[PDB]
Each structure stands twice: as structure tokens, then as C-alpha cells.
């Protein structure tokens, strides 16, 4: 376990500090015994691998630290050695504690300004509570001190230093939860930059602009957009602003800014889409091109669904050759063969309809299966922003249509099974296009939240109630005639009848001409009290609570779904139908950049 | 597109400012190169059509503006020429920026005080963020400056100047969203008025009083009612106020104040009906005359509905001459002819009842069809204040009754179709009279909001669910005997049965004497989980959320419906049954005005 190993490391470090007298005197700033010991091994290390100067920097002992840098000047260069803190120097712990004079004394003794703390306690992990980087400059930028940052820069710290994750100091500053003073430190560190430091990619390929978009740092995004705007004029309450769309539109890039924002796992990333360039950019993209193309694609999919349904209704069936020996058997028709089916003109119309259906199912798999590999199977099917479960049911519908096609070509009986699954899933996949409308999109998201929410727990306890009462009903009617009351004659029939009686979609089985057992009456009274009266209306109460508790999240989810649909439509549709958004700067002498003009009222 | 043209105009204006050195020096207030250029074309124009003095007034450059009015005194008279800003002078941009000394210097050089900015960026449009008028006096009244208003008036600006929309400066002041300081500017501009400026109509025929009523400017209405009130006395906590009803009652006018207020498309116009004269005026009108007349009209309509229903029940039917050849055919009666029907005394009673029904349907079309033309088909049927959908179903009911009348006179079979539509619509039109009661009016409005709200989206996804499961059920029972389970024998029958099974108004089809396919069991279990359990109760949860989220709007909608019903009853009923409201001033020597007395407690 990671917690037990870190706990053992911490108590071992404290124990080896306690056993060593030099480490103890560096811990509680005991000057007298320090002078006695330094007058009388100075490079002894603890369990972490740290020196006594590390202990003095850890416990904020300035006098003790100056004492052992006077006695041992080389002690200000050695880092810790063992795994959880390897690379940590005394400069790192002095910078973390914001001790200005200790940092000055360490830099006077020869502390490295580019020491890399590559330990496991400094990586960006859920194990670590903080992620301040690996360099002392990143640590000083993240603790919140200006003066140690200027001191480290004037002593020769690399501003463009990258850690093991590839993050520069700008990336680590953006990854902080302060979100307000990090802009001041960003301005301070950009003052010393004058390629740019703002265009140095991450190991994930992210600029600091793209990292601020992904992590949902809205204040940092607004601060970054100040340097990319230009106020054209201000006339009274009206002002015209010219936002740069180079980093935002990301034309020609395989992974754009908006694609990374709408496919981010953070809940705060959807608030980037409501900012001052981005909201009107995606609104213009949706109003001018996204909505009509989504509407005609929805119309084409509805026509394709109508064609598939009409091919399902007119499927080839012949009269059953085998006689109905069993009285309970009611099958009078059976499937036709390959040569027996397509012999008429209506069969040729159904043939071209089925060819259109198979062509549409192949086209569906040519558009979805590449999209799993570009993003990932966890994000393509798990993110409701991109249309997660809808892609699952669409891929399943295409697979079932191809299974029915090879069933037809192989002449296997039982086409009704994949045709029924394909019909239900393909028709329920038309709700994917509901996200393009304000009337239906939030309701579809609420359906998605209720299916994976209240319905799952309700069905989980419903299985228990239905199993118990179905077993009780089946053992109650195990001694009676199944002709007079056949709801509980067989145990699967008892389970189905009890499920239907819970949902009250069938009547309570009562035959007044005969004498039912009293155990059925008592068990069904309890079933009607607990299942019908209590549980079926408690589901309505629970969904009524959960409906108003997630309505705001539902609206923001729908807005981000509209933006992600716009991004998907711009990525997949041809370029000649999706012109580049914004105003071209080459027509007006502003270089090769594209801008978006916003006129606001203050 | 209007946004792209305005964006191109703005970037072209900035580009032509950037290319020209005179426009550039007027932009960033470069005095040195300005003196060099003026010592060395001065009337050059940009893309907008503006001079360099326009640029100096736009970028608030006082010294630059004084420089080119010293060099070119005629430059302070030329307006912009091209379409989006035609008529805009430098005085307009100086007034917009609230530059007092620049306005003084322009007026010293000979700037026109009555320049009309007839461009497309100054009209009252949703394209423009502001509507400040076309004259510099309206601009100075709307930016919020007293001093430039007094300066422009003392320099000879017309206070009664009207723009292309016909609005005076009072109208444009009322159309501002400040709503508090606009009263101070209204008092300032009325101080210089002393026909009155307050009685100058709009091109829509509106006074500033009527414009404040239409736009829902409640603070401006309260400020306007201070000049039309008169405190008779004040005795302790009791004070008696005498409000003038000349502008409010609008006796003799075809388009009154209250009719314009209740038929306004703004949501804030319904708050005018709660103000200090208007609320008690419409309350006295409703309590004294509106409620009893509405009650007796509702009673007459209920009696007419009873007569029409009784004529529908006793309709002439004869025994079917053709034999029932088809076993499924159950039609045993058919319609009588014209000469065959009215042969008895009960047939004569039904004849006079049907004549009363046709007379009522003709009277209905004589009262509604004129009212569409006076207001408009979008507002008569779209505004729930006036009874929008109720007029639609009433006109449809009258049309269906006349269609049944010509069907009877033409002897066409199939009267049951328009008689069924007419019965349902005419009986559901009795809910129009529910607005006169506190118990039923808000509930009727909530029904209207739920029909066009949650029910529409629920039915839109319900069509998808029912279509998919109906197709699955029909292909499941395509091979079985239709005698033992005929719910899904035909595809329209499968669609109807699946809709009924979703709403659980029929039982789940189960025949325990025969063996149903397992695909029906799996598909119906999924149908009962998704449609019956999830969706049918999620509709209740969604309507429970939407009920409490619009309840206040429901109450205000009902109050405005009561006021609009009072206005309609006063307009349509004869004058001898609706006496003029208020206290006549001729009986007490106060001229020919009518007043309403309000006694309040402070
Ligand atoms: C038809 C279905 C329309 C449903 C939405 C509606 O009620 O009308 C919509 C109008 O309609 C449109 O704006 C688009 C034009 C009709 C849709 C084109 C065919 C799509 C059919 C396949 C449909 C996919 C099937 C969905 C799953 C069943 C309502 O408009 P709105 O979207 O609520 O936004 C209103 C805001 N606005 C006024 C600023 C724009
Ligand atoms: C969801 C609910 C899921 C239910 C689906 C399973 C259906 C089983 C049908 C079956 O095989 O029964 C057969 C018998 O076999 C048995 O009687 C033993 C099965 C009973 C245990 C069921 C719990 C399993 C789910 C636990 C999972 C966790 C649930 C949540 C916690 C049918 O038997 P019969 O036809 O009646 O004929 C034999 C009787 N006779 C000999 C007397 C004539
Ligand atoms: C009969 C229906 C009455 C419904 C309202 C009611 O419950 O009684 C109403 C009283 O009744 C009246 O104030 C009017 C007198 C009876 C209505 C006259 C016949 C109208 C029938 C055709 C009816 C149209 C059919 C509507 C569609 C079905 C209740 O009063 P209220 O209105 O809730 O306001 C109470 C506030 N107040 C006490 C200050 C006044
Ligand atoms: C609202 C729901 C509206 C439903 C009303 C339409 C009713 C159609 C009835 C019909 O004509 O079917 C007939 C056939 O024709 C077909 O089978 C093709 C029709 C299936 C497509 C239905 C989707 C149309 C709605 C999409 C609009 C968007 C919906 C929202 C997104 C009936 O066929 P049958 O009687 O079964 O006999 C033939 C079968 N046999 C030869 C095997 C014997
Ligand atoms: C007998 C078979 C056909 C079984 C497996 C039935 C499955 C259907 C009824 C279920 C399986 C997964 C379901 C499902 C998953 C997720 C969503 C997203 C939501 O926003 C709209 C509804 C929607 C689309 C629903 C509709 C109902 C579906 C499609
Ligand atoms: C608890 C949740 C997950 C819901 C969906 C479960 C419902 C159970 C009670 C339902 C769903 C599918 C049903 C079902 C499907 C098909 C058949 C085949 C039929 O010839 C005998 C009954 C039988 C075996 C029934 C029994 C009851 C089942 C198992
Ligand atoms: C088979 C036919 C008769 C079809 C078309 C039925 C239509 C009826 C049921 C529908 C059509 C329009 C509906 C309708 C529209 C608007 C309103 C306003 C609301 O505040 C009260 C209910 C009311 C009055 C409802 C009642 C139900 C009506 C009248
Ligand atoms: C989705 C919303 C808008 C609601 C109202 C739609 C409901 C559908 C499922 C209903 C409404 C009217 C129904 C309907 C009306 C009349 C007939 C004639 C009958 O001889 C065969 C069934 C048939 C054809 C059914 C089929 C199911 C329909 C089409």
C-alpha cells in the first residue's frame, strides 16, 4: 500500500532524527550541543537520506543551518538519496518554508539552482497532496513568494526548466488551486522570458493555454486572454474587442483546443466554454453551420431508421410446414430461405432496402471505430459530453445488423432475436440527435442520469423484492391447478408475473369461481403494501428529489454537449462545408492570424 | 449576415485608419506628426466615411481635435457618408464619450445641433446594443450627462426632434435600461418644454405614457404618475390621492392604454397593471362589471355546450340496410338522409336545437374573426394573456360545426368525424372561462405551460420509444397466431398497443394457455423497465420540478389574464352595460377629466 510505505518512511525518518544527536540538535535548534558536536561525522544521513542541514531547513532553524554551513560548506550541495525524496536539497525545503535568509545563505554556500527533486513525493499523483514541480524555481513560484523567485532567477535558475512530466514552471503554476495570485506569478515569470515559454509543449503535447483549457482554470484562461485581445475602439458604453483565435480555434491541428476541453475528465473544463472568446465562437459555429448540418443528419438517420423498420416489417416469412403438435404451440409461420425469398418485385424493393440498411451499418462502423482509437475506449463510451452510451448502442446496432446480414446469407433460423435488439437499439439511438435542441437535450441528459442513478439502485432492491415474493407465490401455487391460476405455475413464469404485478402492468390474479389459498391473499396483500404502494411511489419521490438536485448540472451538460457536437461536426465533415471561423487578418494587414470581434456594453 | 458585414466594416475602418497617417495621428494623439502634416489633403475619409476629426472624437483626443479644427474649421460640419454610420458627425461621438470641452469646441466651430445620424448602427434593432436616437440631444440625454443637454439646448437643439422611428427624446429616454436617472433627465427636458411634448405620438401612435406602459417601465410609469396625481388631504396616517385617468382609461380611443399593456410582447408590461392607479382601476372594473358579465357569459356558453351535446346524442340514425358480411364488421346503424330525418316532433326539437347551435357558431365567428385583424394572428393566437390557444380551439370548433352543417345539407356520410372533433374542442373551450376564477385560472395556465413544455418533449422521445418497441413487438409476433395474441398482429395495431402499454391503460398481453415466444418476454421486460418504470414516473418528476419553478409566473399570468379579460369585456360589450369608470370632474368643477380616488395608509 502507498499509505503504509509513506507512513513507515515518515516514522523511520523521525526515528533516525531522534537517534542521531546532530539531527536532533538541527531539529530543535539546540545551539550549545551543536557547537560541542561540531567542535568534536558531519555527512551522516537519515532514513530518507537527508543531512542535518535538511533537518534545519525542515524545522526552520536559521541559526543551526548557519552553524553547519559554517562547519560544513559542502553540506549545501548534497541532495537526499533514497526513493521517496531523491533529489531534494536543502534549498527545496528552505524555499517551501519561505525562509528568505536561509535561501540567501544556501545560495551563498553554493546551492544548486537547477536541482531536480525526482522523488515520489513531488510527482503529480493522487498520493501527493501538492504538485509543486521538481526545480526550486517552480517551488518558489508555487509557494507564493515573489522575492525568492527574483533571487533564484538572478542566481541563474532556468525559467524554461522541465520536470519528468515535461511541465514548465508555467504549467505547474496553472495546476495550482490558488488561481488568483498564480496570474501575478505568471506575469512575473513572463517578464523574464523577454521560441516563447508559452509555446513549450507538455509531454502530453499541451501548451499552458491548452493546459488551462483542459484543467478548467477559468481565471487563468481569462488572464491569458488579456494578452491576446485588442480593443479597437471605445465609444461611450460600447467597446469593440478583437480576440485572437490562434490558440483557441487551432486550425490544422489534429488535437485542437476545444476538442481537448470538451473531452476532458474534469468537471471545471466545461466552464471554459462560457468565456469571452470561446462562447461566441462556438455559438457562431453552432448557429451558422452546426445546427443545420445536425438537423439534416438527424433527418437522414430518421429516414434510414424508417427504411430499416420497413425492411423488418416486410421480412420474408412462409407458412410452417411442420404441424402444430403441441396445443400450447402457436407458431404458424417460419422464415424463408435465400433462394425462396427474393423472387418477386416487392422482394427486390426489400432487397435494395436491406442493401441500403447494410450500407448504412457499414458507414456507421467506418465513422465510429476510428473515433475510439483517437480518444480512448474509457472516454468515448464514458463521457456523456461526447455521447457516451449513444456510441455504445450505435455500435451495437451496427454489429447486430451485420449479424442479421450474415444470418441471412448463412440461412440460420432465429433472425427475430438480432432484429429485435437492432430495432430497439437503433430507434433508441435517434435520441442522440436530441442534444441539438433545447427542448429535448436536457431531458435526454436527465434520462441518462436517472438510468445510471435512481433506476439502478431501485432495480437492485427490486430484484430482491421480486425474487422473494416470486418464490413465495410459486410455493403457494405449487399445490393448485395451473389451469385456474397460471401466473405462478412455473418459477420463471412466477418471476415474470411477480415483476409485472410489482409494476401493475397485469391484473392481480383472482378467480372468484374457485377458492384460492389464503397464503396467496396474505402474501399478495403484503406485496401490494410494500411493492405497489410503498416502493413504486418512493421511486417517483426519489426521482423528484434527484430531478431538482441536478438540474443546473443538466443545463451545463447540455451546453457542453452542444459544443462537443459542434467540435465533432467540424472535425468529421468535409472542410468545404465548414469554412474557417473568424475574421482573416491577411485582408487587413494584421499578419496571418484569425480574429473574432466582440462588441459588449459596459 | 449582419454580424459579418458589421465586422468587415469595423476592420475596414480600423485598416483605413491605420493606412492613413492623419487618421493614425488623430487616433493615438500624436501631436508632432499632426503639426508636420497640417503644415504640409485634410478632408480624406476612411472606410466608414469619417474624417480625422471623427477619429479624434472617437479616441477622446482633445488636443488633436483642436489642432484639426484650427487647421480645418469646416471639418466640424461634415458627417459620415457610407451606410452603417451615415449622418454621424463628430458632435455625436463627442457627446457619446461625454467630452464636455470637445463638445464646446465643436459648437464653437459650427457643429450642427440638429444633425440626424440615420445610419444602421443607430436604429432600434436587435443588431444594435444601444438605441440612443439620431439627434445629439437624444444622445446626450441617453448617455447620462446633464451639462451637455443644457449646452445643446442653449445652442439651439430642437427638444421636439423626431427620428426615423418617430420617437421624440422622451420616447428614447423611456426606452433606456437605466430606469432611474432617466426620470431626472425627463424632468430636465420637460423643464424646457414650458401642444405639449408629452402628447407627441410615435409612428406606432404611442405617447410616452403609452410607450412606458408598453415597454413595462414601472419606475418611469410611477414617475409619470406623480404629475397626474393630487393629494386632497392628509389626516394622520391616512391620505387621499386623486389620480387622473385621462391617459390610463383612454375613453373613446380605439387603442387604449390597458389594451396596449395587456397585449404587449414584453414580460415587464404585466407589472404596469400592479401600479398605484391601474391596479385599483382594473380591480374596480373586474369586481363591479367584469366578473358578473363573465359569469353569465360562461353560463350561457355552458348552456350552449349542453344544447350542442344533446343535439349530438340524439342525431338521426337508421338501421343499416347492407348486411354485415365481414365477421369483424360491427356497424349496425347508419346515418339518415335529409328528408328521412326531420319527420317527427323530437326531430323538430333537435332541428331548433341544431339551429341554435349553428346560430351560436356563426355568432362565435362574428366575434373572433374581427379580433384577429385588429391585433394580428401572431399575437391573438400566441399570447396566453388574451387567451391564445382558446381562440384557436374556439375558431376550430365553429369551423367544424359549420362543416357538419354543410355535411348535413349536402348529405355526406361521416358526420361522426367533425362531430367528435367539435365536441372535444367545444367542451375543452369551456376552460377559457376558468380565468375569471382564482381557483381554476392558474391551474389552467399551468396546464397550458405543461402542454407546450414537458408534454411536448416527453411525447417527442415517447414517439422514439414507442416506435422501437412497437417494431420489436410486431416482428416478434409476426410468426404466431393472431387469434391468441392480437395486440401486435398489424403494425398500426402494434403501434397503438405499444402506446397503450406504455401508458398502462391496457393489460400486458399474456395467454398462459399457450406458449408465447421468449423474445416477447425479454422485450416486454425491457419495455416495462424503461417505458413504464423509468419514463412514466420521470414525467411526474419533471412536471413536479417545472410546477414549482413557474408558479410565481403562473400567478402573474393569471392576474394579467384577468385584466385582459376585463379589457376585452369593456371593449366588446355595449356601452350602456359598461359605464365609464372613475369620478367625473364636471360634477365638481375640475374640468372634463375623470379621476380615481385612492386612500392609503402610511
Ligand atoms: C422535428 C423535431 C424538432 C424537435 C425540437 C422542436 O420542438 O422544435 C425546435 C425548432 O426546430 C428547429 O429549430 C430545427 C428545425 C426542425 C428540425 C429539422 C428536422 C430534424 C428532425 C430530427 C430531430 C431529432 C430527433 C430528436 C429525438 C426525437 C425548437 O427549438 P429549440 O431547439 O428548442 O431551440 C429554441 C431556441 N431558439 C429559438 C433560439 C432557436
Ligand atoms: C433478477 C432476478 C433474476 C432471476 C433470473 C433467474 C431465473 C431462474 C429460472 C430457473 O432456472 O428456475 C428453474 C429451477 O431452478 C431453481 O428453482 C433455482 C433458481 C432460484 C434462484 C434464483 C436467484 C438467482 C438470482 C440471484 C442473483 C442476485 C439477485 C439480486 C440479489 C425453474 O424450475 P421450474 O420451472 O419451476 O420446475 C421445477 C420445479 N418442480 C420440479 C417442482 C416442478
Ligand atoms: C360554478 C363554477 C365555480 C368555480 C369557482 C368556484 O369554485 O367558486 C368560486 C365562487 O363563485 C363565484 O364567485 C361566482 C359565482 C358562481 C359562478 C357563476 C356560474 C359560472 C359557471 C361557469 C364557470 C366557468 C367554468 C370553468 C371551467 C370548468 C370561488 O371563488 P374564486 O373565483 O376562487 O375567488 C375567491 C376570492 N374572493 C372570495 C375574494 C372572491
Ligand atoms: C408517431 C408515431 C407515428 C406512427 C404513425 C405511422 C403509422 C404507419 C402505419 C403503416 O403504414 O404501416 C404499414 C406498413 O408500412 C410500414 O411498415 C412502414 C412504416 C414504418 C415507419 C414508421 C415511422 C414513421 C414515423 C417517423 C416520424 C418521426 C417519428 C419521431 C422521430 C402497415 O403494414 P402492415 O399492416 O403490418 O401489413 C404489412 C406487413 N406484412 C406484409 C408482413 C403483412
Ligand atoms: C430487450 C432488449 C432490446 C434490451 C437490452 C433493451 C434495451 C434498451 C431498452 C435500453 C438499453 C440501454 C438503454 C439506454 C442507455 C442510455 C441512454 C442515454 C439517455 O440519455 C437516453 C436514453 C438511452 C439511449 C437509453 C434508452 C434505453 C436503452 C437503449
Ligand atoms: C432487476 C432488474 C435488473 C430487472 C431488469 C430484472 C427483471 C427480471 C425480474 C426479469 C427480466 C427478464 C425476465 C424474463 C425474461 C424471459 C423469460 C423467458 C420466459 O419464457 C420465461 C420467463 C423469463 C425467464 C423472464 C423472467 C423474469 C425476468 C428475469
Ligand atoms: C382526437 C382529437 C379531438 C384531438 C385533436 C384532440 C384534441 C384535444 C384533446 C386538445 C387539442 C389542443 C388542446 C389544448 C390546448 C390548450 C389549452 C390551454 C390550457 O390552458 C387549457 C387546456 C387546453 C384547452 C388544451 C386541452 C386539450 C386540447 C383541446
Ligand atoms: C408522439 C405523440 C405526438 C403521440 C400523440 C403519438 C401517438 C401515436 C403512437 C398514436 C396516436 C394516434 C394513433 C392511432 C390512431 C388511429 C389509428 C387507426 C387504427 O385503425 C389503427 C391504429 C392507428 C393508426 C393508431 C396508431 C398509434 C397512433 C399513431
Numbering used by the authors:
A (entry chain A), B (entry chain B): 28 to 67, 71 to 224, 230 to 637
Task: Copy text verbatim from the article accompanying this structure deposition.
Transient receptor potential vanilloid (TRPV) channels are a group of six polymodal cation channels subdivided into two subgroups by their sequence identity and functional properties. TRPV1–TRPV4 comprise the first subgroup of non-selective Ca2+ channels, TRPV5 and TRPV6 constitute the second subgroup of Ca2+ selective channels. TRPV channels are blocked by ruthenium red (RR), a universal pore blocker for a wide array of cation channels. Here we use cryo-electron microscopy to reveal the molecular details of RR block in TRPV2 and TRPV5, members of the two TRPV subfamilies.
Notably, in our experience the addition of PI(4,5)P2 to TRPV5 consistently yields datasets with a majority of particles with an open lower gate and extra density for PI(4,5)P2 but none similar to the RR in the pore. To determine whether RR occupies the SF in the apo state, we collected a dataset of TRPV5 treated with 1 mM RR, yielding a single state with strong density at the SF with a C4 symmetry at 2.96 Å resolution. Asp542 forms a polar interaction (3.2 Å) with the top ammonia group (Site 1) and the carbonyl of Thr539 and possibly also the Thr539 sidechain hydroxyl form hydrogen bonds (3.0–3.4 Å) with ammonia groups coordinated with the middle ruthenium atom (Site 2). While the position of RR in TRPV5RR is identical to the position RR occupies in TRPV6, the RR in TRPV5PIP2+RR is positioned notably lower in the SF. In TRPV5Apo, the lower gate is tightly closed and hydrophobic and the SF is also closed, but provides a favorable environment for the entrance and binding of the positively charged molecule.
